[PDB]
Structure formats: C-alpha cells, structure tokens
Amino acid sequence: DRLKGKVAIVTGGTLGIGLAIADKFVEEGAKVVITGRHADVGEKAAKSIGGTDVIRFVQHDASDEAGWTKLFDTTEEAFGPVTTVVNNAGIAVSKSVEDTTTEEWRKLLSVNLDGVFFGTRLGIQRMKNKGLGASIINMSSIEGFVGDPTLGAYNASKGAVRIMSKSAALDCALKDYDVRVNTVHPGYIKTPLVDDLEGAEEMMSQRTKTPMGHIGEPNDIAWICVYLASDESKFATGAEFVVDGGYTAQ
Amino acid sequence: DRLKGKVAIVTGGTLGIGLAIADKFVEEGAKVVITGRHADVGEKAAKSIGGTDVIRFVQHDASDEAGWTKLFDTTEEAFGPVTTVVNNAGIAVSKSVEDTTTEEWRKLLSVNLDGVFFGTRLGIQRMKNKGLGASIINMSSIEGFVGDPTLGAYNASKGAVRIMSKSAALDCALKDYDVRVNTVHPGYIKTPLVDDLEGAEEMMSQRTKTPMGHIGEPNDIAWICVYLASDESKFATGAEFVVDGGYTAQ
Amino acid sequence: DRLKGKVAIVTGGTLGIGLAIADKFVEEGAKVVITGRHADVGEKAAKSIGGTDVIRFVQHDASDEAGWTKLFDTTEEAFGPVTTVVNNAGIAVSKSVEDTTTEEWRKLLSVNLDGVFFGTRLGIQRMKNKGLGASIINMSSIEGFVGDPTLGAYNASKGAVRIMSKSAALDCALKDYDVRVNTVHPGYIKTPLVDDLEGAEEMMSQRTKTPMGHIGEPNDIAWICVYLASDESKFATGAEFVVDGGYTAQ
Amino acid sequence: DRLKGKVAIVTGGTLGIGLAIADKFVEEGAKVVITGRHADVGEKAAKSIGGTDVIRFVQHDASDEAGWTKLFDTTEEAFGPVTTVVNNAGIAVSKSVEDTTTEEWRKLLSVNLDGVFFGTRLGIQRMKNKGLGASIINMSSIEGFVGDPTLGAYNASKGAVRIMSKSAALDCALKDYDVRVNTVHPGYIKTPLVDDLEGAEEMMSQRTKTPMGHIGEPNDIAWICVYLASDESKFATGAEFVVDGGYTAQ
Ligand SMILES: NC(=O)c1ccc[n+]([C@@H]2O[C@H](COP(=O)([O-])OP(=O)(O)OC[C@H]3O[C@@H](n4cnc5c(N)ncnc54)[C@H](OP(=O)(O)O)[C@@H]3O)[C@@H](O)[C@H]2O)c1
Ligand SMILES: NC(=O)c1ccc[n+]([C@@H]2O[C@H](COP(=O)([O-])OP(=O)(O)OC[C@H]3O[C@@H](n4cnc5c(N)ncnc54)[C@H](OP(=O)(O)O)[C@@H]3O)[C@@H](O)[C@H]2O)c1
Ligand SMILES: NC(=O)c1ccc[n+]([C@@H]2O[C@H](COP(=O)([O-])OP(=O)(O)OC[C@H]3O[C@@H](n4cnc5c(N)ncnc54)[C@H](OP(=O)(O)O)[C@@H]3O)[C@@H](O)[C@H]2O)c1
Ligand SMILES: NC(=O)c1ccc[n+]([C@@H]2O[C@H](COP(=O)([O-])OP(=O)(O)OC[C@H]3O[C@@H](n4cnc5c(N)ncnc54)[C@H](OP(=O)(O)O)[C@@H]3O)[C@@H](O)[C@H]2O)c1
Ligand SMILES: [Mg+2]
Ligand SMILES: [Mg+2]
Ligand SMILES: [Mg+2]
Ligand SMILES: [Mg+2]
C-alpha cells in the first residue's frame, strides 16, 4: 500500500533493525533486496519475509565497493529501477577513544562510514532524474548526536553519516534529482548488536539513559523508515529523525 | 486504519496545515475535533472533511484558558476520551525584534506559546494513565531552529515550544503516563499564513532558502503528524521532526 | 584590558552569575551598571567590585519595560554610550508542565523572556550604527537545549531566548548595525538560584547529569561573557556558547 | 599571561588558522610546536612568531601515526609536559558526494578524521592525570553542523570530528583525567584553503551565506582557541564553539 512500486536495497537486512525494515517494506508493497555477509542467516531471513517475487537475499559486505555496482544491477534486473536505498549495515566497538586500536578504528569506519558513502554515492548516480521519488535513508544513531565514553569510533562514524547525508540531500535538491536523503537516529534497540554490548540493555534501560525505562524494538525503526521511503515525506530531505525513547531529550 | 480508536483535538484545524492534519486523521480512522475562532469558516471546514460521526468543529481561541477545559469535555462527550492533542493554532508577525511592539509581542506569544502550554498541560492531566497510547503533537517550526531577521516574536515562540515539549515528554516518560510529546518543525508551507506574509512564497522558494526550489503543502505536515499520532511511533518522544525541503540542512 | 572602553549593562548583577560577570567585566576595563530589585543587596554588590568610577548599582526589574529606557539613560549619563548588554536577570520555578500554575508560568516568562526581549530590543535601538563594537549577551541555559521534567516554564523561556537572539543577531548583521547577539548556556552553577532548587547541587553533581562530577562556579560564565563582550569575538554572532561540564555532551 | 605554563601542539600551524592560533598562543605565554608537511614554509612560519625558546617547527603529516609519538616526545623534551593539543591540520575537496572519487574520499578522511583521532587518542594518554589542566581542541567547521552540496567528504570528516570529540570529553571527565575536549566550528575564514576554493570568498560573503557580508580572519579563530586552551574554560568540555559571522544562525 504505502510503498507501492518502490524497490528497496536494505543493507544488513538479515538481522535486527534491517530485518524489520525489510519486513515492513514488503508488507507495504515494496520489493526488497537485503544484504549481509553470512549466507545461511541471509537466506533464512529473506524466506522468512516472502518469496523471491517480493524479496531476495544478496551476500555483500557494505564496505565492498565493487560489489555495490553488482548489487544495484542485481536489484534492478530482479525488480526494476531501484527507488530506495537503506544504508543500515553497521557495527559497534566497545572502546573509548583512548583505548581504540587503529585496526578497530579503520574496520568500523570502513563499514559504518565508507559503506554508507558507497551506497549513497551510487544511489544518487543510479536513481537521479528518473521520476522515481527516490529516497536514501542512512542509519545514524543517537550516537550521531551525543557522545558515549566507550563508543569513540562509533560516535565518529555516526556523526559523519549525519552530516554527509545533508550534503547529498542538498546536492540532489538543488539539481532537481528527485532524490531525498535523510538520517534515522535510533536510540537503544533490542538487536543482536545490543546483545553483544555487555550489559547495555540493563544500563540503557535506566531512566537516566532512556526516560521510558526500556529500550525499543526493531519495528520502532522500521516504521519511521517506511515514512521516509514513501511519497508521504516528499518534502522531507536533509533532516534527522530520532526514535530513542527520550534519550536525547534530557 | 492507522489511527484506529484515536480521538484527536486539532487546534486551528479550519485552515492550512491544521485542516490537512484533521483531514488525514479522519482518513486514518481517528475521531477529530477542530477548533478556530471563526464559526462560519470552522463549520464549513469540518463538513468538508466528514460528518459529525468523525469530525466536529468547536469555536475556541487557544489562548482562552478556561475554554480549554470545556473543549476537552465537549470532545470527550462526542467521541470518548481524548487520545491525541495537536497544538497547531498559531500566528505570525512580520517584525524584527527591534521593530516589535510590546502588543504584537504579547499577542503572538499568547497564542503560540501560552496556547500550546494550556493544551499540553491539560492534555497530560486528562490523558495520563489511561492506556490510550496518548500523543501530544506541538507545532513548532524551522523558526524554532534558526532565526529570521523579521520574525523575532515568532522565533521566540517556536523556540519555547520546541524545548518546553521536551520537558513534558520527559515528565510523562519518567512517570509512565503513557503520553508522548513531540514537536513538528515545518519549513515554508503554502497556507493562508504564508499568503499573509508578503512575498514570502517567492522568496522562500529561492534555492538559498528552500533547496528544493519550492515550498511545501499542508499534506506534507499532515502525514508526519499521522505517524506521531499513531502507535507506530510508540518509542518516539521528546524529539523534533523536520519537514522543510532542506531549509535547515544548509 | 580586554574590555577597554566598553560600557556594560548587566541585569541581575547583584548575585551569582551576574555578579561574577560584572566583577570580571570591571577587571578587564569595562564600565558596568548592575541591576537588581533589592537595593540593599545591590548597593553592597556594586561596592564589593569597585567604586562608582567603574561600577554602579541601579534598582530595576528586568520585566519593567518603562524602566529599561531610564536604565539606559542613567548608564549613559554615568559612563557614556552603552556598548554591551548582558540580559542575565532570570528566575527558576521547580514545576512540571503538568503542575505549573498559570501565575507561575506568566511570572517566570515575564522575567526570563519579556525581560530579555525588552533589553535586546532597546539594546539594538540604542547601540546600532555607532561603531561601538556592540555586543548583546543573552543568558539562556542547557535548559534551552534539553528539557527537565520539573523545569517546564523554565525550559520554555530558555528555548525562546535561544532562538529569538538568533533573529536579532541576523537583523543586526544584515543591516550592518555593528551589534552582535549571542547566547550563553551555562550548566549547573553554584549560585543562590541553584541553592533555592532543593537538592539540585547533589543531584546534578551525579555523573549521569554532569560528567565532571561537580557543578560550576560563577566565574566559569563570567569568562565566556568577557570573550563575547570583547572585540575578540567580532566574527561571532547568532551562536550558542555552552559551559556545562559535559552535561549536554551525553 | 592567559596561557601561562601551557605547552601546545598545533597541527598545521604554519599557515592560515593554525598559524594565528600559534601566534596568539605564544603571545599569551604558551610554548608551541607547530607541524606541517613543507619544511620551508614551516621554518619561516615558526621564526615569524618567535625563537626556539617559545616556538619550534616539526615536519609531520597529521595522518602519520608513528610520527605522532615522536611529536609528543619532541615537544615534551623541548618545553616540558604537553598540556594543549590543537588538531587543526585539515584539507578540503570540492566535490559532491556523487562526484567524489574513493581516492579523494580516503585521502581527506585520512587527514581530517584519522589525523584528529591520532592526536586526540595520544593526547589523552599523555596528558591525563597530571594536573596540567589539559585541553584538546579539535577543529571542526560549520560544515560539521550543516551540509554543503560540493563538500561531501569534507562534511563527513567534520561531522565525525564533532561527535568523536564528545566521546573523548565524556571519558576524560568521568575518569577524572583533567583533560577537556572541545570542538571549534569556524565559518568561512580568509586562508589559503579558501583561496584554493574557487570563488568561495565572493560567494560566501553574500548575505544569504554569511549575514555579516564578509568572511572572517584567522585571528577570529585564534582567540576562541585561546579561551579553550586557558583555565578560564575549566568547566567547558564536550561543547561546540561557533565563530561564523552568523552563517548557521539562518
Ligand atoms: N541496535 C541499536 O541499538 C542501534 C541504535 C542506533 C543505531 N543503530 C544502527 O542501526 C544499524 C543496524 O543496527 P542493528 O542493531 O540492527 O545491528 P545488528 O543486529 O547486529 O544487525 C546488523 C546487520 O548488518 C549485517 N552486517 C553486519 N556487518 C555488515 C557488513 N560489513 N556488510 C553488510 N552487512 C553487514 C549483519 O549481518 P551479517 O553479520 O551476517 O553480516 C546484520 O544483519 C546499525 O548501523 C546501527 O549502527 C543501532
Ligand atoms: N505555514 C507555514 O509555512 C508554517 C511553517 C512552520 C510552522 N507553522 C506553524 O503551523 C501552524 C499552522 O500554520 P498555518 O500556516 O496553517 O496557519 P494558517 O494558515 O493561517 O491557519 C491557522 C489556523 O489556526 C486558526 N487560529 C488562528 N488563530 C487562532 C487562535 N488564537 N485560536 C485558535 N485557532 C486559531 C485559524 O482559524 P481562525 O483564524 O478562525 O481562528 C486557522 O484555522 C502554526 O502554528 C504555524 O506557526 C506554519
Ligand atoms: N545558576 C545556574 O545553574 C544557571 C544555569 C543556567 C542558566 N542560568 C541563568 O543565568 C542567570 C543568572 O543565574 P543565577 O544562578 O546567578 O541566579 P541568582 O543566583 O538567583 O541571581 C539572580 C540575580 O538576578 C536578580 N534578579 C532576580 N530577579 C530579577 C528581576 N525580575 N529583575 C532584575 N533582576 C533580578 C537577582 O537580584 P534580585 O532578587 O534582588 O532582584 C540576582 O542578583 C539566570 O538567567 C539563569 O536562568 C543559571
Ligand atoms: N579556512 C576556513 O574557512 C575554515 C572553515 C572551517 C573549518 N576550517 C578548518 O580549520 C583548519 C585549518 O584551516 P585553514 O583554512 O587554515 O587551512 P590552510 O590555510 O590551507 O592551512 C592548513 C595548514 O595545515 C597544514 N597541513 C595541511 N595538510 C596537512 C597534513 N596532512 N598534515 C599536517 N599538516 C597539514 C598546512 O601546511 P602544509 O600544506 O605544508 O602541510 C597548513 O599549514 C582545517 O581543519 C579546516 O578544515 C577552515
Ligand atoms: Mg577512513
Ligand atoms: Mg543529553
Ligand atoms: Mg506573556
Ligand atoms: Mg542554516
């Protein structure tokens, strides 16, 4: 319904937030290609949402530049012209700036920053001037707004994603590309990422962190992405959309 | 559909943005009471959207404090317990801070600030702890983010609404009131308000103002309000939602 | 030294932050008039900093509009043309939006908002186009950035001051008035205001509030005001300056 | 005077903003080591400010990780324990996100992001827990707040610097390291960087960009850095300091 005729690429769409985004996208009429590095997890994820007439899994590392062009070619051949790109693939490292190894630093930014750049850049090139009502949704974080003492590299990547997206949004708007670029800034969401962050759920459920006294679910982010992907938000570009249970409000 | 069982008060719902919010709210299954100071315009506005089974007009000035209590009583009698409050009623004065008369200053703030406060305060008192999935949507502006040399009082009011709403959102969250509070920050939208601002449409359509090269329509704001009113945004509180064609992105 | 030839009005300069601003202003060569409602405290405050050749007390309520004109006339007669206005006079009420009486609401805003407006508006009219390197410094807060569940009216006032100042700054800049307008956003500072907020010092000293593990002192705000008052910041206008021990960084 | 006993490393201190920072730092009593890639420009710069008793040039690429440790060792041997680190070295590329080569992307981020990370990380390790009143000043930009259609990679780096610094500031504060971390966000400043951006000065001097109708000078940024380096700002950490002639205010 709300995403009629839309064709979406959702990176890291096999687990957590990305899975829910893909799930709700298909539910609203969109055709979706999800990516991930693990094929077994990926195929199970895709089949869990629907058949290959609406959703397909493509194994792809978001930091793999050459693979991005093939990903677009695959999606377009399968479903027609890509209209929506969700740069969701991302990882977290639990290290202060002081304690961050250069290897940790480079690896996180390769995925969280370079991966988003690859998708956004190619997304603009491929979707511009085609009357698709194209939408690029880049997954930032509340960590793109505020800092965390043990998420140094993570903070850097999300701050980068936040502002880089504004540049793309402006360029597309000024050149009448019919492409919108926005960022989503989830608070803490119950996902495998958060499960891997030791004690994060109990600590961030505290009122001093999340005022609602609990963390969110992947569907909380799926629904704001549906809005941004749909023509409902045709006047929304370059903006930041925060779903965080009040985290950044205090 | 998306607003099933919701009962909404939309202040200033007889023209422009408020009218579209009411229009789309009814479309998504909500019961709506719209307010305005002019009865002739108001009654015509309500009938243009639907019958009295889904929408009714109530004559009410948002700055009328005593009237707010009667408004809630009237809405509740007609449709049952209020679940949604859209503090949308607002006015603009085209004056620099330097050139603003104290009368202009007090009158704009009476409506834009005191009115939003009256609605938010009573909204919390009336909707808390009732499992309604209550949502309070306060209409700020891009003028709550950036200044304009000829919108002094307006800027003050929208900045106040922006941050006051965060206070309410936090209070409701920490006390488990089941009430969410968010602000919407429209860019320039084609409405009687903008029509009353001499030459505003052509000037704000310039790329140096709105990068998309045009201003928005009332439906652009209606749809984000639908999202905030719905249980889809159950994890969104204390946040700011900007639909401005890229105005604040540059 | 750093404020040579400057003539400053500092509202609420008899205690706390305002007192320190006046103290350091005089130290850096400026002539200062401090205001307050209590004459006994005020006269003692002025004499504690210096003689009437550098600082004088004038009894004046910031919400007294007519009194503002006489204040400027008095200051100018004593020290020559005013070059600097610090709208610092402000009060706090410890109430949620829900629990705020309309009387509390109107009174806080009368001082914190209308007072700042009166000073800013007249400040522009009186200091523009005189080559004074004029600076208007409006005292907002971290509560102009984030909300607090028990500072509803306060949050509104500080958000208003934050954005209204931008309007004034832009107007002055575009019209080449040689007047700059900026806002200062202190975190929690050890003052009679904070002392009047029951238990505020111990609670806001907690790491979850102020990361430095303590609140600030009035001199912390004095020194950033000295910078904004001086010609050192001749390229700074419409901006927000935060001294909060990291409060808003998390 | 204001920087008594301070020992500063200023990366890219041989031209533009960095040169002025070094100049004013020495003027205020600090000992300074400036870096740059070109030795001839570097030595001329250092000698132009003072003798080797107050300032020395060290040839160093900010993206050279191993060189950073030697830089700290050199500075400390020459002047005693480092107290201040100004991560100022940075470059700009005039390309939209769409038109940005991966090489351009990687090279800019290597300097503007990785360089700042190297300096901040080592800065914390070397200056913590020594009672130095240590200050880390990371040079972001207005391009870390808003986007520009032809500064894609640049926007990314400055957004990254903006938020990464907050993480460091929090960690240092919570662990009582006696190290502060803040970001400076200059508007357009007359420097060789801006001269290399074709037509940037005339375009950004337009009122629609910089409201003051002109761009700034390197000293405008030097003076805010002096404040941040001095003990005057001992309560300021994790914050953003904007000197932009009103650019981001509209
Ligand atoms: N969960 C939160 O609290 C939260 C909060 C704010 C922002 N975010 C952001 O939302 C995004 C998703 O978060 P999440 O919690 O859902 O993470 P997640 O649960 O761990 O799932 C991440 C997904 O991305 C895939 N992936 C991981 N690395 C990849 C790579 N290099 N290339 C392609 N795909 C990759 C993963 O599959 P494979 O491992 O098999 O590759 C997985 O399907 C992230 O960008 C995150 O930064 C999350
Ligand atoms: N249009 C924009 O570009 C724009 C941009 C950002 C934010 N906003 C905000 O969005 C809100 C609505 O904007 P708008 O453009 O649609 O305004 P509008 O076209 O002029 O319509 C305002 C509506 O509010 C009613 N109203 C006016 N004063 C009232 C009062 N004291 N009490 C109750 N109702 C009142 C009006 O009806 P009556 O006159 O009969 O009372 C009218 O129905 C405003 O708060 C505005 O500040 C608008
Ligand atoms: N202290 C903090 O933690 C903090 C944090 C952020 C922002 N601020 C802001 O910084 C400003 C000063 O704070 P503060 O802590 O130093 O307050 P304070 O300790 O209570 O002192 C307030 C000063 O203003 C005067 N004053 C009060 N009401 C006035 C009025 N109507 N007209 C003129 N003068 C008046 C008071 O003298 P009289 O009573 O005799 O009139 C007093 O000298 C305030 O605007 C506050 O909102 C403070
Ligand atoms: N100018 C503006 O309008 C403006 C506005 C906002 C932010 N900023 C930021 O302020 C900082 C300085 O700006 P600027 O205008 O003064 O630039 P600039 O005039 O071109 O000077 C940059 C200085 O850094 C040195 N440098 C360049 N690349 C380096 C590297 N890889 N390693 C070490 N040193 C290096 C340069 O010397 P060598 O070439 O010999 O190496 C030069 O001395 C930058 O981070 C910039 O992003 C500038
Ligand atoms: Mg990199
Ligand atoms: Mg916070
Ligand atoms: Mg009033
Ligand atoms: Mg702007």
Side-chain angles (χ1 to χ4, degrees), chain B residues 156-197 199-209:
Chain B
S157 73
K158 295 315 194 179
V161 166
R162 176 183 176 190
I163 310 304
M164 187 230 76
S165 300
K166 293 184 190 302
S167 174
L170 292 174
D171 192 41
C172 291
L174 295 172
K175 295 189 176 183
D176 296 328
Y177 275 176
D178 189 32
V179 179
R180 302 179 291 107
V181 185
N182 296 278
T183 47
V184 175
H185 303 251
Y188 281 85
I189 304 301
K190 174 66 176 180
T191 66
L193 186 152
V194 156
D195 296 339
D196 208 40
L197 294 172
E201 181 170 4
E202 197 203 348
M203 288 187 299
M204 298 304 157
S205 289
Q206 303 290 352
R207 304 296 185 149
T208 51
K209 296 302 161 182

Side-chain angles (χ1 to χ4, degrees), chain D residues 80-109 111-126:
Chain D
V82 181
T83 67
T84 314
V85 176
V86 185
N87 286 304
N88 165 87
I91 60 181
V93 172
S94 190
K95 288 292 201 64
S96 60
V97 173
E98 178 189 17
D99 294 339
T100 303
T101 72
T102 305
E103 182 174 350
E104 282 166 343
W105 176 264
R106 290 198 197 280
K107 183 49 164 58
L108 184 148
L109 286 170
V111 175
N112 292 19
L113 179 48
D114 294 347
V116 169
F117 163 66
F118 292 154
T120 303
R121 172 181 65 182
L122 184 54
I124 294 165
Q125 297 172 356
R126 285 290 205 100

Side-chain angles (χ1 to χ4, degrees), chain B residues 106 109 114, chain C residues 106 109 114:
Chain B
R106 290 199 197 280
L109 286 170
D114 294 347
Chain C
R106 290 199 197 280
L109 286 170
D114 294 347

Side-chain angles (χ1 to χ4, degrees), chain B residues 1-3 5-39 41-43 45-46 48-69 71-102 104-109 111-197 199-250:
Chain B
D1 193 273
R2 287 172 67 201
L3 297 182
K6 298 300 183 184
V7 173
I9 293 170
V10 183
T11 61
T14 70
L15 299 172
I17 289 167
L19 180 70
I21 291 168
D23 183 32
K24 295 320 188 187
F25 273 18
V26 168
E27 182 174 296
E28 291 296 340
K31 304 295 193 304
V32 177
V33 164
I34 58 181
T35 71
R37 301 165 303 157
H38 300 87
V41 175
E43 286 296 342
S48 76
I49 290 165
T52 56
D53 54 319
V54 298
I55 187 171
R56 298 177 189 204
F57 166 73
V58 170
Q59 192 182 39
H60 176 246
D61 191 310
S63 69
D64 167 26
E65 185 178 359
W68 263 102
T69 291
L71 175 62
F72 261 85
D73 287 346
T74 295
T75 303
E76 184 160 352
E77 178 188 1
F79 298 136
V82 181
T83 67
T84 313
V85 176
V86 186
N87 287 304
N88 166 87
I91 60 181
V93 172
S94 190
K95 288 292 201 64
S96 61
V97 172
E98 178 189 17
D99 294 338
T100 303
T101 72
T102 306
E104 282 166 343
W105 176 264
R106 290 199 197 280
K107 180 49 165 171
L108 185 148
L109 286 170
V111 175
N112 293 19
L113 179 47
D114 294 347
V116 168
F117 164 66
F118 291 153
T120 303
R121 172 181 66 181
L122 184 54
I124 293 165
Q125 297 172 355
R126 284 290 206 100
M127 301 193 297
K128 66 176 182 177
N129 300 327
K130 290 174 169 174
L132 304 170
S135 181
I136 295 175
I137 304 167
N138 294 335
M139 197 63 62
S140 184
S141 177
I142 54 171
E143 309 296 343
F145 272 88
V146 297
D148 186 282
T150 66
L151 295 178
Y154 192 79
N155 285 132
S157 73
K158 295 315 194 179
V161 166
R162 176 183 176 190
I163 310 304
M164 187 230 76
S165 300
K166 293 184 190 302
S167 174
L170 292 174
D171 192 41
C172 291
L174 295 172
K175 295 189 176 183
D176 296 328
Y177 275 176
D178 189 32
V179 179
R180 302 179 291 107
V181 185
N182 296 278
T183 47
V184 175
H185 303 251
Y188 281 85
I189 304 301
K190 174 66 176 180
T191 66
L193 186 152
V194 156
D195 296 339
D196 208 40
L197 294 172
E201 181 170 4
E202 197 203 348
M203 288 187 299
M204 298 304 157
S205 289
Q206 303 290 352
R207 304 296 185 149
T208 51
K209 296 302 161 182
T210 307
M212 279 187 181
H214 65 84
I215 66 177
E217 61 168 328
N219 282 346
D220 294 321
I221 307 310
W223 286 124
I224 184 62
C225 291
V226 165
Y227 164 77
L228 293 175
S230 76
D231 297 339
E232 298 163 17
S233 61
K234 65 191 206 308
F235 196 55
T237 201
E240 304 145 340
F241 295 80
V242 184
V243 186
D244 68 347
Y247 192 106
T248 53
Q250 57 175 7

Side-chain angles (χ1 to χ4, degrees), chain A residues 45-46 48-76 78-109 111-186:
Chain A
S48 76
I49 289 165
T52 57
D53 54 319
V54 297
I55 186 171
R56 298 178 189 204
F57 165 73
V58 170
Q59 192 277 343
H60 177 246
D61 191 310
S63 69
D64 167 26
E65 185 180 359
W68 263 103
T69 292
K70 295 182 178 181
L71 176 62
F72 260 85
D73 287 347
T74 294
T75 304
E76 183 161 353
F79 298 137
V82 181
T83 67
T84 314
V85 176
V86 185
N87 286 304
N88 165 87
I91 60 181
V93 172
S94 190
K95 288 292 201 64
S96 60
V97 173
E98 178 189 17
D99 294 339
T100 303
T101 72
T102 305
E103 182 174 350
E104 282 166 343
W105 176 264
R106 290 198 197 280
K107 183 49 164 58
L108 184 148
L109 286 170
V111 175
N112 292 19
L113 179 48
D114 294 347
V116 169
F117 163 66
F118 292 154
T120 303
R121 172 181 65 182
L122 184 54
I124 294 165
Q125 297 172 356
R126 285 290 205 100
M127 301 193 297
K128 66 175 182 176
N129 299 328
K130 290 174 169 173
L132 304 170
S135 181
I136 295 174
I137 303 167
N138 294 335
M139 198 63 62
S140 184
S141 177
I142 52 171
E143 308 296 343
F145 272 88
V146 297
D148 185 281
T150 65
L151 295 177
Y154 191 79
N155 285 132
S157 73
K158 295 314 194 179
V161 164
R162 177 183 176 190
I163 310 304
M164 186 229 76
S165 300
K166 294 185 190 302
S167 174
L170 293 174
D171 192 47
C172 291
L174 295 171
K175 295 189 176 183
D176 296 328
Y177 276 177
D178 189 32
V179 178
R180 301 179 290 106
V181 185
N182 297 278
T183 47
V184 175
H185 304 250

